[PDB]
Structure 1
Amino acid sequence: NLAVLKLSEQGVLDKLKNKWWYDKGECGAKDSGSKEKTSALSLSNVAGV
């Protein structure tokens, strides 16, 4: 009871949670969600015209 509150006070829980959830961003959208590609227009876009 006195021990877990020390880890909550000193951010050790935050550090462990960061280590085991956020440092292992692996798959796709977390990494590549903030990048940019310009374009290249294909025919599948313009067909109803």
Structure 2
Amino acid sequence: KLSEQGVLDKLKNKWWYDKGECGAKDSGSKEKTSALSLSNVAGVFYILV
């Protein structure tokens, strides 16, 4: 009965995640891209200035 009413799912979300110190860490794992940025070519601008 506790399984089908989601009360086991409710307790699992509260103890594992809501008392979690790594707050909303799953959002940071999403972003990924591959291109040249300013950090790669920063020294060329420093020679230019």
Query: What is the TM-score normalised by the length of structure 1?
Result: 0.44
| Distance 1:46-1:29 versus aligned 2 partners, 3 A rule | farther
Unaligned runs of 5+ in 1: 1-5
May I ask how many residue pairs the two structures share in their alignment? 44
Query: What is the TM-score normalised by the length of structure 2?
Result: 0.44
Unaligned runs of 5+ in 2: 44-48
Runs of 4+ with >4 A deviation: 34-49
Identity %: 100
RMSD: 5.6
